[model samples]
Every structure is written in C-alpha cells, then in structure tokens.
Target: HFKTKLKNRRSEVNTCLCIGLDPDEDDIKNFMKNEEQNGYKNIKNNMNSNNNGIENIIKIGKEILLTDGENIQNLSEEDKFFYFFNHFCFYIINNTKEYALVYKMNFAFYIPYGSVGINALKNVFDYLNSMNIPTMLDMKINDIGNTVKNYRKFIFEYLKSDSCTINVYMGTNMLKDICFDYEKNKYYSAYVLIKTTNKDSFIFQNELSINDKQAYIVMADETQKMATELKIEQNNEFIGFVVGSNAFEEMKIIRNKFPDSYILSPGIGAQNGDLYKTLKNGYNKDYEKLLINVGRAITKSPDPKKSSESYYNQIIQIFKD
Candidate 1:
C-alpha cells in the first residue's frame, strides 16, 4: 500500500526524496528577535503593541516569492544580516514539497506549541494531502497490541497520512495481529526501525541474538515475513524498514535479504550520510522503493526550492550515471 503510492507519486516527480518538516518555534522567534535588533524594530514592536503580550505569527505559503522583501526563512547570502543563509524548517517544508515525493513530519517539534502547533501542522498536512502528495509521520511509536492498536487508528485514520515510522523493538507482534488484519488497513504502511542514523544505535540494533543472528537481521526477517504471510504486496509496500543512509553496508545486505519490502532511509545531507553510497547500494530494480530524506540541509538552505531542486537533480544524475 505505502509502496504503491510512493512509487506512483515518485515516478511523476522522478525523485525518491522525502522532505523533512521539523520546525522549531524557538528558532523562528530567535530569528525574529535578530531581525528586530538590527532593523524592522518598529514593525516588530507595533505587532507587540497588543496588551495581551502575544506576538503575531502568520505563515505565508510557498506560492509567494521574493520581490521587495524579507524572506525571514532564508539564512544564506540572501536574507538579511547573515553573511550566509539560515533557511528555517517551516519555510523549507512550505517551499520544498513541489520537488518531493513525500513529507516526513516530526511530531516532537509541533507538540510544544499545544493545540495551535498541532493545528498549524494539520493545515500543512491538509495542504500536502490536497496536492496528491503523501506524508510520513515520524512518530517512532512502539507498543504491544492495545496501545499499538489505538495509535494505528490515530495514525492511519485520524492523521490520514499514507505512511508513518514505528519502533519494532516491542517485537514483531506489534504488527503481529493488528496490522495483519488488513481489513482496516488498506494502503497505510509502517517503516520499522532496523538501523537508525543516530550514533550509539549499534548498542541495540547491531547486537547479536541468542541464535547468533544480528539483532537488526532478526527483526528484518521477521518483519518482512509478516508482510509476505499476509500477502500484503501492493508491489512492495505495506511493510518497510528504516535503514539509516549512513548504514550503507548493512542496507546493502538487508536490501538483498528483503527485496519485496520498502526502505525509508533517513540522514542524508545534514547527517553527512553518503548519498552516492546509499543510492548505489540501496537502489532496487524498480528504482522506486527507496526514500532518502534530508532535513537540515534543506530547511537550512537560503532557498529551499533551489535546495530541493539540487537534491532532485542529483537523483536524476545518479540514476543516469
């Protein structure tokens, strides 16, 4: 289910990249304060002229481009005072989606703002949905049957996202009975963490099982088998694995082992994962089963569209090469 949608939109855009939408409220305000200190002080203070002491924060969509103005989102040679660009995360998501296959939203960043933050996220979510683009919630949720079931309903039904990430440490049973039912789940897919990009991930994921199978290997086999047993083949979806972009060797090995499963590889660019290594090794015959994600590199660009374009162009060049 997840793979079908991913490949469909991916073929149209011709890019296997998933834009990361993780915005920081603090970064936004800090940038605002920086601008106020140097100039725009009057507009800033006047906006705060309200007795309620709340600052006005409005989001402008990507359709609007620079003319006379201030793209506070830029942190590069463009924008204001900075000698270099510092494109903010929210701005990146707003502008970069046109060049992407999916947008992966991290819930942690939005939770801090309470309902307002969530609503803002939903607005972005709805916009992406309307575009025929999909979103993958980076919820990293892990639980047994009951807890996992409610989260399943919330993520697949309420969130209305095509796919999401989950932690499979609670054992293969997380999807053991829940996801297998398939009556409720049609296209919704879960990308289980096999080998993550973060440091120290080896402490758990790289360990050896009692029977001598490596921890991640054991997990991957079981996860992929479940999808097969349920006949959840939408030409490679329903079940996916999170293989960090940096884990090139392991990814290559896992790809051969589970050709039918999709792989969501995060940690390119900002995380310094080798794009070439990932593509060369992780690429499947269909060329549509991989989703490489770059967060900070995109969100921090002086121009997000340009950054996304650059990433897409690389994808084109890599395939052609």
Candidate 2:
C-alpha cells in the first residue's frame, strides 16, 4: 500500500514528521482569502477543471464567502467550512518542501460534521496521495475481531488507506488477527499503544509491578518482545509500536530493544511532552523509521504552516548529524 511509498519518501526526506491536518474553520477561511488575493486562481481553475465544475465553484465560493464589507475576517460559518477544507490542503502542498513524510487525518474531527466533512477528508487524501505524500487514517480503531476485520475491508480495500493507527489494549489475539489478515498487502501498520501520555495515564501505568518494576516497564518490554517475535520473523512489517512522551526513560529502553520497529510517538506540543527529550531518548541514527506526531500544537496554532515548519525543523536539527 502506502508503506512502500512512505519508505521511499522517508529516505528522501530523512525525517518522519507526520503533520496533522486537523484545521479549524477559521484557519481555512484565512488561507482561502490569502490564496485568492495572491493569484492562485489560475492554478485553482486549471486543477478544478479536471475535477469537474464543482471545484471551480468551491474555489470561487471560498473567495466570495470570505469577503465581507469591512474585511475578509468576518466570514459566515458555511463559508468558513468550505474555505478551510480546500485551503488546508493547498497550504500543506505549498509549504512542505522536504520536511514531511506523512499527513495524518484524525477521523474524529471530520466524522462529526457529517457528509461534507467526510467528502472533504476523501478529497484531501486523494490530493495528498496525488502529490506523492503518504497519508495515515488515525482512527485508533479497537473494536471486536469481526468488526475490526470488516473495518479492514471498508478502510483498507475500499477506502485504500496506506496505514492506520490501532490500539493493542484488546490483547494479543485481536492484534494477531489484524496482523495476520492484513499481512498480505502490507499497507496497514498496527501501532500498539504501550503507554499513553495523558495526566490520568499514571493512574494505571504508574503502579508498581509484583516483580518490582513500573507497570509501564513491564508492558513495554513484554509487548516489544512478543510483537517482534510474532511479526518481524516473516520479513513482514508487522512491527509497529507506540511510546508516549510521558514515559521517556522507558521509551529509551524500548528503543534499545526493538530498534527496527516503526515507532509512533505522540505527546508533544499541547500535551506538554518535550520533543527534545523525546528525540534524546527515542531517536536512533536512522530517523525516518519513527513517527513524531504533533496534534493540537500544529492544528491549533495561529499559523499552521509556520507551526509545521518549526516542528519539522526541530526534528531535522535533532536527528541530523
């Protein structure tokens, strides 16, 4: 699936910065106005013509919707909605030079808005893939085995995703089923959650083990050994793990053990996890094998392009020799 493409891109970029494109309506409206005033219309028109008249109308509507008597700042809700969806994609393609490996679309943000939101998401996915940038559907899926299998058909086969985020709290059986069933395509990478970074995470993760180690330590070590043994032996990439920023010391230990596994670290930015410390602990000589996810920090930033650039630069500085 998209893993091959991502692997290639990783080599080219030398960084695994997965920018979350979870833009708010206000951000979209601002981007639409900027693009329109800067003569992006001709390019927009040409691209829209290929997608039929809908895009042209959407583009024109975005411009008109953003324009108000006093300024373009007072856009209506409907206008804001339309402008952001298109503009967000434009911003990513225009601003991302060689810093980004993947764009993760959080399903929760898009699903609640109904069909328009869903269509916007699909359009963004198609657009990003067309630009040769890999994408991840961050559904964090953790249903029953049957339902999870159905999700594979609907999400992987039907929707044609490159990779997906999965929770491993349901035990190894369910995780095994997902890996076994989806192993043929090698499209989906199951990211098992070992330790989450939320404040309440310590409620369960901080407890001492009967053997005298931290609960998180026990879980991380065991999960890594088990997952590696099960999937890595077949030359298949059933090797993916999640390491929260809250448990940096423990993450270092996991990294030492499973250096080859694709590690997804999500706790930076709004969650108050230090990227510098995360890199100090989690980053190996090879950086692209890791995914450093920044959700609210980028999405909620006043300037997402600037925010993305800063985070991307931080990663490069941390890993570059």
Candidate 3:
C-alpha cells in the first residue's frame, strides 16, 4: 500500500521529494523570528503615512508578540508549542504539496514534547490522511515478536501512519507477523534500514561481514530471501529498504539486488549527500521506488516553501538524464 500510494503520488506530483518534517525548538524559534522580522520590514515599508500605518504596525506587533513572545496568560509553553507546530506543518504542507510526493515525520522530534506534542502530531497526520497523502512514521522500531505486534498497531492504528521505518537486525522472525498483516490487505508496509545515512554506520553496516559479503549486503540479500519465503513479491507495496544516499557504491549493489523494492535515501541536503550519484545509482529503473528525503535543510529554513520547491526542481533536473 505504501509503495502503491508512492507510485500514484509520484505520477500526480511528478516529484520524488519526501520532505522530512523533523523539527525542534531551535528550528521553530528561528523560523518564527524570521517571520517576525519580515513582517516588521513590510509594515515599516508602508510607514511613511502616519496614522493608518502606525495602527497596522501596532496590530501586527501585538499579534506576534503576545501570542508567542510569552505574553499570553491562558497558554502554557506546551500549548504554544503545539499551536506553532500545527501552524507550521499546515503552512509547509499547503505550500509544498504540489511538488511533494509524501512526507516523512520523525518520531524523535515529537516524543520529547509529551502528550500534547503527540496530539499535535496526530492532527497533522489526520489532515494528511484526509487529503489522501501518505506519511511515514520514522520510528526505526525493532523489538521482539510480541512487542513488534503492538508497535505495528501503534504505527498504523494509533498514529494513523501509512508506513514506518524499521530495523531488521532482530531478524525476519521478529517481523514475520507484521509482514503477515502487510499481505492481508497491503494497508501497511515497512522500510527496513539496511544502510543508514549516518557517519558511523560503517562500523556495523559496512565493515562487518558474513561469508565475505558486507553486513549491509547480507541484509539486502536476506531481505529478498525473506520476501520469497513469505510468498510476497518484492514490490513497491510490501517490503522496502533504507539505503543511505551518501553510500553510492553500496546503493548501486543494493539497487541491483532488489530493483523492485522501494529505497528510502535520506541525507540529501543537510547531511551533505550527493544528489546526482544518489538518484543515478540508488533510484530504481522503474522510477517509483526512490524516496529522496531532506529534513532540516527545508524544515529549518526561513522559507520552507521556497526550500522545498528548490529541492523539487533539483530532483526534476535529474530526471532529464
């Protein structure tokens, strides 16, 4: 289901951009500050007129300063945070949906804010679901069989996410039941982290080996094997792999290994991943299985819409080849 949705969205939007909605206090604060400054500058530009201009400036200042500058009496810090988070998410979605294929929301950013943060996050997901936009819960969860069953429910039912990131190091046995549910109706899918987009991932994913093949290669080979054993075709709808965009050579090998399965490659922007090499090598020939994710570079920017559109155009430029 995840892959099917991805394919359809790609056809509709003509972009492979998976905007990562990973936000923190600093990002929010900086963006809001930029908004305030821009608003101030525009209001000042028209301030040559005395009475009406002064009134407009005061009204705008009051709106920004009181709501989020710690002057509101009825709202707690958490409440203000949810307000900002919800507003910012809506802003980004409305501005970039035309160019975005899907969104990847990182759970790590919201869990720290407690119950209210989760509720805010749920609101964002509900909004996207209503619009028929698929979202990936970037949890990277891996546990025992019983625990993973609950984790699956938490991702699909509770959080209402269409899919989630997972760790396969615990082996296919732990994920067998989850994959069973995937086959039942295809409403859920898992993106297994074969090679992550981080600096030290080589310590285990690359350096370690079994039978002379690297550990990541072994992981990719085993994923294909499990798909066959489970009687599921390794297509966009069911199983997928998370290969780092920075690891071009590894991605080339993994892409050849499972050409039909989706490859989610983060680290495109803020992490300094090479976009050309990533799309050239990691992007499947089918053109429906590559998800290029960029998080902070867009989300943390003063103009998220502009940043997303720029990244979208960059991806489109690659398609010319």
Candidate 4:
C-alpha cells in the first residue's frame, strides 16, 4: 500500500526528491503552544482538566474515545509531536507533487526523549505511511552481524519503515543482512558516511585504503560492486550510496563507478553545500536516480511549503535544458 502510493505520486511528479524533517525541540514546543492558543476547545479543555496533571487528562481522552467515539481535538504531547510530523508530510506531499519521492525522519531528532519520544517517532512514521508517503529512517546504524540483523527487523518490519539509511563501514555483509529481500517489497537501503562534505570526514575515510587505495574508494567502488553482485543473485536492488553534497570529487568518483544506483545526497540546503555543484558532479547520465536532500532549508524555513516548492522549481529549472 505504501509503496503503491509513492509510485503513484512519483508517476505524477516525475521526480524523486525526499524532504527531510528534523525538527528541533523548540519547534515542537512552539507548535504545541500555538495550537493551544488557537482556542482549540478540546485542547484547551484537556489542558485545563489535566492541570492537575497531563497523565490523567491523557487517560481521560483515551477513555472518552473508547466509550463515546469522541475525537480528542486537544493535542497531547504525543499528539503535538505526531501532528507536526504528519503536517510536515502532508505539506510536502501536497505541495511538492511528483517532485518529492519519500519523506525522511532523522531518528536522532526524536530518540533523546525516552519512551514518549520513541512512541512519538513511531506515531510519526505510522501517520506518514498511512498517508501513502513512503518513509525513511535516517538512522546511520552500523553494528555487528546479529545486531545489524536486529536493527533491520526493528526498523523495517517492527517499525514498518519502507526504507532506511545505514552506515557502510561494516562492509557488504551487513548490507546483505539488512537488504536481503529489498526488491521483493520495493524497499530500499541507503549506505552512508562516505564522501561526506564535512570538514572532518577525510580524517578517517580518506585514510583507510582498499587495493592500496583509500577504504572510501573500495567502499564506493568495490562495495557497490559487491552490492550489485548480491542484487543480481537475489533479484533485489540496493538503493545507493550517501555522498555528501560538498564532497564533489568523491561524488564524482562514486557517480562514475555506479552510474545506475540511487545516490542519496544530503547537506544541500542549510549546510551550505552547493546544489548546482553537487548536481554537476553527481549527475549520472540519467538524473532521476539522484535523491538530493534539503532538510533545514526546507522544513526550517519561515514557510516550509513555499520553501520546498522553490527548491523543487530549482531542480526543474536545472533539468529543463
């Protein structure tokens, strides 16, 4: 269902931009306060009634829904969190049209708050998938064999995410474990922490050598070869590599090697990575496989929808001729 919905949108829009929503704490608090001030009666009533405590009011709201099928208009902390997430998804899907492919939720953005935070993150994923927008958990997970498999099950099956970003430092074995049956469900796994534009990235990636070359090269060239070998046998497609938007030389190297794989390029908007330069360097003979990401520049803008639309237009203009 989720995959079908995304395909439909892609067919309509003919683009594969996935907007990243990594909201900060202040954003969540501000949205909740604004919702409260708007005189949403249910919310106000719940807040006032819960004045004794939010826990009790939340219990009441849940019970009321069970007994009377009543709608809880007031936002709980959970509600506010999921509401912001869903609203962002809706805004991007409705506004970006085919220009957007999927929405990515950075796990770090929601994991620091304990169980409530975790549940809220799950709720956000559920809500977005419910809307038929495929979601990606930008987890950057890298672990040993069993742990890697566990992470795959937790994120893909348990969490029901359509896709996820993973660190490739662990080698092809880890990817094989996580992306074993990816093509069967049209699911994808993005390998990352490579060719990043960060000032400190080269400290490690540029040093480790493969076949006498840097390990980054082996991962970018040989590892992708390994993924492709797996794809041929398994009849699945490993999504692509995560190249930093600023790492133009590395991006060029990766693009040259794997011209057909889906490239996940982040750090474009707010990170000051040049989109045009990334495009120039990362552009495969065919452009559709590029998943150029803009997180803060879009979601954190004064007007998210409008800002996203502007980005979408920029892409269209670039591709026009």
Local distance difference test values of all predictions, in order: 0.69, 0.65, 0.73, 0.64
lDDT of 1 by residue, 78-159 (tens): 2232111112333455467678888998878767746545555655565466556778888888887867778777666666
| Model 3 per-residue lDDT tens digits across residues 1-321 | 566687788779887788898778886676556547665332232232223322333221223322433343466665666656655665566666777788999999888878856776776686677678879889888889888888877778877787788888989775565655654544357788898887999999988998779999888778767766766544445668898888988889988777777888999888999999999987765565888998888887767779999998898788788
Can you rank all candidates by lDDT, best first?
Answer: 3, 1, 2, 4
- Compare the candidates by TM-score and give the number of the best one: 3
lDDT of 4 at 198: 78
| Candidate 4 structure quality by residue, lDDT tens digits, 103-167 | 78888987776665566566556545555666779898888766787887778776788778877
Better of 3 and 4 by TM-score: 3
Candidate 3 least-lDDT 10 residues: 53-62
Checking candidate 4 for backbone clashes, the offending pairs are: 13-98, 43-74, 208-215, 209-213, 210-213
Compute each candidate's TM-score over C-alphas: 0.78, 0.77, 0.85, 0.78
Pairs in clash, predicted candidate 3: none
Across 1-321, the per-residue lDDT of candidate 2 in tens digits comes to 444676788888777687766766665566566666766552354344433423443323445433332343576665556545655655554455356788777778777667657766666665665556777777777778776787676556555566677775565555555554654634345666667777777776667574777766676666666666565435445446678776787678778877776777887887888787778888766565678887768766656668878888887787664
Error of 1 at 123 (Å): 1.7
Better of 1 and 2 by lDDT: 1
* Best first by TM-score, ranked: 3, 1, 4, 2
Q: What's the true lDDT of residue 165 in model 2?
A: 73
lDDT: which is higher, 1 or 4? 1
The 10 consecutive residues of candidate 1 with the worst lDDT sum are 78-87
